[PDB]
Amino acid sequence: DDSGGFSTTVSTEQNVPDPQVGITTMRMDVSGVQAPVGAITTIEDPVLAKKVPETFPELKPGESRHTSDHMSIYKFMGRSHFLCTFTFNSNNKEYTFPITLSSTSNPPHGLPSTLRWFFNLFQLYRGPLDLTIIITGATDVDGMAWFTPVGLAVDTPWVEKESALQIDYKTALGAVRFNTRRTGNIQIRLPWYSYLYAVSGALDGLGDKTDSTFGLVSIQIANYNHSDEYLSFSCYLSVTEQSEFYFPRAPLNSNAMLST
Amino acid sequence: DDSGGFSTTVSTEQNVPDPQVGITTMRMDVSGVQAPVGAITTIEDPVLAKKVPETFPELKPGESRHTSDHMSIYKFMGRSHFLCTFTFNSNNKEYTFPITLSSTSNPPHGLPSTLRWFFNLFQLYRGPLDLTIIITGATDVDGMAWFTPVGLAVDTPWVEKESALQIDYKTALGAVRFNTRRTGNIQIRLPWYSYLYAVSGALDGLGDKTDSTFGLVSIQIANYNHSDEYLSFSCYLSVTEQSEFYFPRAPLNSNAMLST
Amino acid sequence: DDSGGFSTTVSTEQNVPDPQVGITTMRMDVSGVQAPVGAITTIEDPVLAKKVPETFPELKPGESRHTSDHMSIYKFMGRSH
Amino acid sequence: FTTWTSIPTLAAQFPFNASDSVGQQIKVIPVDPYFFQMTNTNPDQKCITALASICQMFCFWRGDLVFDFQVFPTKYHSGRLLFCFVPGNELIDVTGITLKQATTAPCAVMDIAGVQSTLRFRVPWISDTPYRVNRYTKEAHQKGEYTAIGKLIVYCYNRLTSPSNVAHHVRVNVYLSAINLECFAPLYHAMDVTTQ
Amino acid sequence: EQMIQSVDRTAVTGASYFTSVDQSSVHTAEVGSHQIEPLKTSVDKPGSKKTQGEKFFLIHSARWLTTHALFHEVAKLDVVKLLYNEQFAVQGLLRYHTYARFGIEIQVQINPTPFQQGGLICAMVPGDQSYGSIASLTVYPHGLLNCNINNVVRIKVPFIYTRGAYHFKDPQYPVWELTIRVWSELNIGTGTSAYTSLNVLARFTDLELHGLTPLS
Amino acid sequence: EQMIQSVDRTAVTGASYFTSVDQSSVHTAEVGSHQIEPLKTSVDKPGSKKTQGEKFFLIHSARWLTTHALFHEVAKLDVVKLLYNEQFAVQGLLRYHTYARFGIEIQVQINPTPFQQGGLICAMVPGDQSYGSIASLTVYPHGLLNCNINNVVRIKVPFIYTRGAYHFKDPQYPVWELTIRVWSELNIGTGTSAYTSLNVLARFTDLELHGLTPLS
Amino acid sequence: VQINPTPFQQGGLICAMVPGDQSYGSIASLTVYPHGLLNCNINNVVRIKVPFIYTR
């Protein structure tokens, strides 16, 4: 031991991640003629709690009949889930929304149904995300979207107003330029630009307003509008292969799972 | 025998699938100088009914003069056939239609002409399908379509109304976002997400409302409309190479073949 | 096991017939310098109840002085009653 | 996602009183990963389990559920419980089953006071369909689609004998995990307390 | 130094589904052993699942008349529901289990005099006699009964179902459905019997049984 | 010269006890084959005679009090008659067969607090608790329950009977008879519980079944 | 963590190490964390060893 401790017992590793592949496959019977000693146990001992359970004679389940494994995070959360939606009402306006992992921020100003469930299953998130925005409404509208890391100057979140920034400051952060007649969709990465190791969701105090947000996406539109037509944007998040997840955590209860 | 039976006769396999390739090819004459013993037979014996028929002296048909084989299911039903059509009439509405294989559901609320014929030729269907939707009508209309498996909460089928679901629930199931000015078409797969082995068409009772449907596609539109313009959607189904077909069945009669 | 049972313990045979010939014969001492561990026991365990009893230092009884064995059924009940 | 589903977390809580008769059904459990009944007062919340959080985000489930029954006696209570599994679905008239009739089904007894505290009751997968649907999204019942593979009954096998200077009841915790779990066809759903 | 052995505290016993964890245990006390019979009191093979479940049972008796027209349905019967009855020996295996997976063996028997003429068809239709054609009943596993040729047909089918097993207490829909249609009409002369009797035998094959349950 | 084959007239079919001789026969028509499940809907082993007959069943629940005197008989029960009841899964095998030959596995369980003291005896007596001595119950296959040492005893016995098998519908006399006598009295102090519960588990071993019969 | 019951008492405790915040998660799922169960019949000492888990 490096720390100078001593013990006569054995210390074992508790709750090892990923103990089994969640597809039916083969890595005779499962239980058999031998008497099941794993039926009776002591749960207060972490060594005896790792014993394989059996009580009844069984046999092997066989193999499944679909190729993919739906119980993996990189395939479950590879599906792009809903993030936010908002509408514009006037000309030359600017809207700003952060991607906050915190569970204190309730929707509409926070993570909705499935993303609120997922980012409170674990402690630490580190890596780039994957944003898709969808344009619904007017046509011949020129818009520009850019990405600001946390700790830098930007307009007020969740408020649609005129922009107090200049065009030299917007285009220096990296921006895209679209038109609502040609595309109707933008599939854009979001870089991992932070000064800290990883961001977390389940925090309070001044750690909730610092270590929860990691990035911040804002959109400005021009050439809107003519007489009577609405313009609506909707955002969707997916996860990438460069991202990582650490330290599993107790899931949210049935009163914190909220939606829009 | 495993089940303990006994017999002095021989049990043979009856109605083996795919006995012949339906193209003219070569795998002298077919019948010849030898007397045709296959003209007379007994049809009540399944062993004697497998005898090759001949009664007249013939010769070989030769080879055909087109490459493909039109008598295969994966090339016949690879052509995309008609499924449904519907129109919108107001703003921010939501339409919902299931893909029901049941023959009890008559069209327009069911399978039309060619798809009703095909899914009652066999007993069991297992695998993913292939949906193409076609937009006809207005422009600058933003729409969103998603897929819900059977057994989950969704709006009422075959009814156009306001949506009672939230944006967190829609985008968590996986959705596409289009605009009617840019594309006019979406060619989208439909995953095989069911809790049962396979779905069937020829059922009655409470097995008809459970084991017939496999999936359910619903579409919501926004930014529609300006003053006077219609909007029409039309759906088409194709079959994939991952799909399977089991246990051939007696085909539908001439009074159940119906169309739109 | 044929019947499908299972156990972590050992099942032993209880009350085996004819454990000893009822004539005095030889099949030093019986008990000796070694401490008698068979004095204390547990009668509720059928495995520990098969332990040979001893508590005091003894020696062998020798041999009897009649040929027959009166403790056999086929000689006891061979007499007509 | 097996990191959360293979963790045994608490789902139920029932006492084993000394004032109940032999053969009386103490508690009945529907055998599905969507079962939990615990809740807390301050703050107002409905305590989900780790298995019901992962399985609520799918349409179809499959696998072997492992119930864990942890008793809290002294060294001086003495009794037995009978854990019976009646295969079927979540809606069968199950309260007419007597104690002698319950030994037809696969069951297991448990001596309460001892050096071990937990009995692991791995339920085999018994079904007519290969998978089993998350029907709690719907609001009406339908014959043929179900959520459970049967119900699990707890009986009073022997009475609870004890002295006068100990408490006259023993409480049992029920844990819930899964082995050979398979789920597919994702959705979104937030579960609710099974008020039984 | 001698060691005094004591009785064992913890042990696990049972027979393959009942598990008993004991804090105070003891060894088993067994007398005798298993003996064979050199003069047997029963010379048949002993009972098992094979000789009780896989055995022919009479499930239906109909009668085919000269007044039934063409394509008239002599027998329309669910095969698996009729085998789930108290009067058969397979009930003792099915009353206590929950799910099953099985194959079906059918034998259909008639008895005409050779002064009669006519025909029947005996098709095994899975699930439902739906909107399909009556003239295409030779696509299914079937058998033709002609009064001149034969009087016994026999059919063997595997398990065809949308789920993995069948639930006897609360089924979704019937697995198999036997129909017997008039394929050619029964004609007689003067004085000949205007009827013939019909009988259907059925049995399971490859019977799997899962999940024994207390509630029926 | 070519030979025209015809349908076979005589054939014998059935499953091991039903024999059908047919004067007009035909070959069997089978579609498909037996398929395995690569994704199984049930992961336990399938049902058989071993997992349904050889399994522990609760047959009796008594209670041992401080008012029962010495040599009082807490439980006097016929073992085989109590297993022949509708509520157990072994009834489905025994309702349809006539004779049987079996071994018995007994497990007796009690639960005292360690402030109690006393003892019991649990002997397996074949046939009859006759005029023999109560103090000589340790000659039979037995087990001693002491409140200080253990709380579970288990006994395994072979088939001991004057005939070759046992007839359930009309028996001659009971095969086994379990008795539970008070071997030392139950004593408590002030406030201690004046009772303890008792439970008897029983199962068959090496079950042979002969002569399936229609009448019950 | 150490407790001391007499063997006439009965009950149980849980001792979980939660990083950062006892947030909106479930109380019935405290066996996901590095934890220990204290039963008055079995034991009276549990011991837990955790690494450094932090956002900085």
Instruction: Take residue C5 and report the two structure tokens written for it.
Output: 């049972």
SS3 labels along B3-47: CCECCCCCCEECCCCCCCCCCCCCCCECCCCCCCCCCCCCCCCCC
Distance from C-alpha of E152 to C-alpha of E163, rounded to nearest angstrom: 33
Which of D33, B3, G38 lies closest to F13 in space, CA to CA?
B3
3 state DSSP class of D193? coil
Identity of the amino acid at A117:
W
Identity of the amino acid at A24:
T
Strands E29-30 and F152-157 come out as parallel
Strands D39-40 and D45-46 come out as antiparallel
Identity of the amino acid at B188:
I
Which stretches of chain C are DSSP H helices? 73-76
| F7: nearest CB among B4, B11, B45 | B45
Which residues, including other chains, have CB under 8 Å from residue B63's CB and lie 6 or more apart? Answer: B24, B25, B26
Which of D166, D174, D160, D171 lies closest to D111 in space, CA to CA?
D160
For residue F147, list chain C residues with Cβ-Cβ distance below 8 A.
none
Which residue numbers come right before each break in chain D (C to N over 2.5 Å)? none
Instruction: Take residue B169 and report the two structure tokens written for it.
Output: 């629930």
Biggest CA-to-CA distance, chain F = 107
Q: Are F166 and F80 in contact (CB under 8 A)?
A: yes
3 state DSSP class of D2? helix
Which of F95, D100, G18, G56 lies closest to E92 in space, CA to CA?
F95
E strand residue ranges, G1-56: 12-14, 37-39
Which of D62, D192, D195 lies closest to D136 in space, CA to CA?
D192
CB-side neighbour CA atoms (13 Å) of E186: 25
Instruction: Take residue A38 and report the two structure tokens written for it.
Output: 């794993």
Instruction: Give just the sign of the alpha carbon dihedral E133, E137, E138, E141.
Output: positive
What single DSSP character describes residue E47?
P
3 state DSSP class of E99? strand
CB-side neighbour CA atoms (13 Å) of E170: 19
Domain ranges of chain E: 1-216
In sequence order, the β-bridge partners of residue D58 are D186
Distance from C-alpha of F11 to C-alpha of B7, rounded to nearest angstrom: 7
Which residues, including other chains, have CB under 8 Å from residue E190's CB and lie 6 or more apart? Answer: none
- H/E element, F145: strand F144-146
Strands F29-30 and E152-157 come out as parallel
Look-up: residue for tokens 């007419």? D96
Q: Are A194 and A80 in contact (CB under 8 A)?
A: no
Distance from C-alpha of F175 to C-alpha of E46, rounded to nearest angstrom: 20
Q: Are D151 and D29 in contact (CB under 8 A)?
A: yes
Which of A181, A169, A158, A126 lies closest to A235 in space, CA to CA?
A158
Counted residue by residue, chain C has a size of: 81
Q: Hey, of E2, E7, E8, E34, which one would you mutate to test binding to chain C, going by the most C CBs within 10 A of its CB? A: E7
In sequence order, the β-bridge partners of residue F157 are F104
- How many CB atoms neighbour CB G34 within 10 A? 18
Which of F159, F111, F108 lies closest to E26 in space, CA to CA?
F108
Q: Is F40 left (phi over 0), alpha (psi -120 to 50) or beta?
A: beta
Which residues, including other chains, have CB under 8 Å from residue B241's CB and lie 6 or more apart? Answer: B74
- How many CB atoms neighbour CB D95 within 10 A? 9
| B197: nearest CB among D130, D138, D185 | D130
State the distance between the two ends of chain C, measured CA to CA, in whole angstroms: 47
Instruction: Take residue B203 and report the two structure tokens written for it.
Output: 């059922």
Query: 95-154 in D: which are within 8 Å (CB) of A?
Result: 106, 108, 115-122, 124-125
Cis peptide before A17 (omega within 30 of 0): no
Identity of the amino acid at A142:
D
Q: Are E129 and E177 in contact (CB under 8 A)?
A: yes
Instruction: Take residue E13 and report the two structure tokens written for it.
Output: 């016993």
CB-side neighbour CA atoms (13 Å) of C26: 8
Structural Rg of chain G based on CA atoms:
14
Which of D105, D100, D79, D94 lies closest to D160 in space, CA to CA?
D79
Tell me which method was used to determine the 3D structure. Answer: cryo-EM
Query: Which residue from B minimizes the CA distance to A186?
Result: B177
CB-side neighbour CA atoms (13 Å) of E37: 13
Distance from C-alpha of D15 to C-alpha of D17, rounded to nearest angstrom: 6
Rounded to the nearest angstrom, the minimum Cα separation between C3 and chain A is 9
Distance from C-alpha of B188 to C-alpha of B80, rounded to nearest angstrom: 12
What single DSSP character describes residue B170?
H
Contact E128 B204 (CB under 8 A): yes
In sequence order, the β-bridge partners of residue B29 are B59
Which of A72, A55, E162 lies closest to B206 in space, CA to CA?
E162
Distance from C-alpha of A84 to C-alpha of A67, rounded to nearest angstrom: 33
Distance from C-alpha of E178 to C-alpha of E120, rounded to nearest angstrom: 13
Distance from C-alpha of D118 to C-alpha of D120, rounded to nearest angstrom: 6
Which residues, including other chains, have CB under 8 Å from residue F112's CB and lie 6 or more apart? Answer: D78, D161, F118, F147, F151, F196
- How many CB atoms neighbour CB E156 within 10 A? 21
Q: Dihedrals φ, ψ of B24, to 5°?
A: -80, 120
| A200: nearest CB among G20, G36, G42 | G20
Distance from C-alpha of B101 to C-alpha of B118, rounded to nearest angstrom: 10
**Contacting partners of chain C (3+ CB pairs under 8 A):** A, E, F
Distance from C-alpha of G19 to C-alpha of A247, rounded to nearest angstrom: 9
On whether the A1-260 domain is CATH 2.160.10.10, my answer is no
Which residues, including other chains, have CB under 8 Å from residue B99's CB and lie 6 or more apart? Answer: B83, B129, B190, B213, B214, B215, B216, B217, B237
Query: Is C10 in CB contact (< 8 Å) with chain E?
Result: yes
Q: Hey, of A132, A234, A238, which one would you mutate to test binding to chain B, going by the most B CBs within 10 A of its CB? A: A234
Contact A35 C6 (CB under 8 A): yes
Query: Which residue from A minimizes the CA distance to G17?
Result: A249
Q: Is D188 exposed, middle or buried (0-12, 13-18, 19+ CB in 10 A)?
A: buried
Look-up: residue for tokens 């054939």? F11
Contact F89 D18 (CB under 8 A): no
Distance from C-alpha of F104 to C-alpha of F118, rounded to nearest angstrom: 27
In sequence order, the β-bridge partners of residue F107 are F154, F201
Distance from C-alpha of B220 to C-alpha of A133, rounded to nearest angstrom: 17
3 state DSSP class of D35? coil
Instruction: Give just the sign of the alpha carbon dihedral B98, B101, B106, B110.
Output: positive
Identity of the amino acid at A126:
R
E strand residue ranges, chain F: 11-13, 20-22, 29-30, 57-65, 73-78, 97-110, 117-126, 144-146, 152-157, 166-167, 176-187, 195-212
Angle among Cα A207, A208, A213 to the nearest 5 degrees reads 110
Q: Dihedrals φ, ψ of A199, to 5°?
A: -105, 150
Identity of the amino acid at F149:
I
Determine the topology of domain E1-216 in CATH: Jelly Rolls (2.60.120)
Q: Are F80 and F175 in contact (CB under 8 A)?
A: yes
Distance from C-alpha of C37 to C-alpha of C53, rounded to nearest angstrom: 9
For residue A40, list chain E residues with Cβ-Cβ distance below 8 A.
10, 12, 19, 21
**Contacting partners of chain B (3+ CB pairs under 8 A):** A, D, E, F
Instruction: Give just the sign of the alpha carbon dihedral A4, A8, A13, A15.
Output: negative
Q: Are B148 and B215 in contact (CB under 8 A)?
A: yes
Q: Are A251 and G29 in contact (CB under 8 A)?
A: yes
Identity of the amino acid at A179:
N
| B123: nearest CB among E131, E160, E205 | E160
Q: Are F47 and E49 in contact (CB under 8 A)?
A: yes
- H/E element, D109: strand D107-111
Cis peptide before D43 (omega within 30 of 0): yes
Q: Is A247 left (phi over 0), alpha (psi -120 to 50) or beta?
A: left
Instruction: Take residue E36 and report the two structure tokens written for it.
Output: 């064979």
Instruction: Take residue B187 and report the two structure tokens written for it.
Output: 């060619």
Identity of the amino acid at A9:
T
Q: Are A221 and A141 in contact (CB under 8 A)?
A: yes
Q: Is B48 exposed, middle or buried (0-12, 13-18, 19+ CB in 10 A)?
A: middle
For residue E96, list chain D residues with Cβ-Cβ distance below 8 A.
104-105
- How many CB atoms neighbour CB E155 within 10 A? 25
Which of F9, E119, F31 lies closest to B45 in space, CA to CA?
F9
Which of F213, F211, F216, F207 lies closest to F104 in space, CA to CA?
F207
Rounded to the nearest angstrom, the minimum Cα separation between D171 and chain E is 18
Distance from C-alpha of F108 to C-alpha of F179, rounded to nearest angstrom: 11
CA E54 to chain centre: 7
Which of B139, B140, B143, B132 lies closest to B234 in space, CA to CA?
B132
Angle among Cα E114, E118, E119 to the nearest 5 degrees reads 120
Distance from C-alpha of A224 to C-alpha of A93, rounded to nearest angstrom: 9
Contact A37 E12 (CB under 8 A): yes
Distance from C-alpha of E201 to C-alpha of E108, rounded to nearest angstrom: 6
Distance from C-alpha of F158 to C-alpha of F101, rounded to nearest angstrom: 10
Which of A15, A234, A237 lies closest to A137 in space, CA to CA?
A234
Which of E169, E201, E15, E157 lies closest to E91 in space, CA to CA?
E169
Q: Is B51 exposed, middle or buried (0-12, 13-18, 19+ CB in 10 A)?
A: middle
Instruction: Give just the sign of the alpha carbon dihedral E100, E105, E107, E108.
Output: positive
Structural Rg of chain D based on CA atoms:
17
Which stretches of E19-78 are DSSP H helices? 50-53
Instruction: Take residue D164 and report the two structure tokens written for it.
Output: 């006068």
Q: Are A124 and A190 in contact (CB under 8 A)?
A: no
Q: Are D108 and E18 in contact (CB under 8 A)?
A: yes
Distance from C-alpha of F114 to C-alpha of D75, rounded to nearest angstrom: 7
Q: Are A56 and A31 in contact (CB under 8 A)?
A: yes
- H/E element, A73: helix A73-76
Distance from C-alpha of E118 to C-alpha of E116, rounded to nearest angstrom: 7
What single DSSP character describes residue B160?
-
Which of F198, F206, F174 lies closest to F104 in space, CA to CA?
F206
Identity of the amino acid at B254:
S
Q: Are E16 and A56 in contact (CB under 8 A)?
A: yes
- H/E element, F200: strand F195-212
Q: Are B206 and B102 in contact (CB under 8 A)?
A: no
Which residues, including other chains, have CB under 8 Å from residue B81's CB and lie 6 or more apart? Answer: B113, B114, B115, B118, B236, B237, B238
Contact A33 C8 (CB under 8 A): no
Q: Dihedrals φ, ψ of E37, to 5°?
A: -100, 110
CATH C-level class of D1-196: mainly beta
Which residues, including other chains, have CB under 8 Å from residue B217's CB and lie 6 or more apart? Answer: B97, B98, B99, B131, B145, B146, B147, B148, B190, B235
Instruction: Give just the sign of the alpha carbon dihedral A237, A239, A244, A249.
Output: positive
Domain ranges of chain D: 1-196
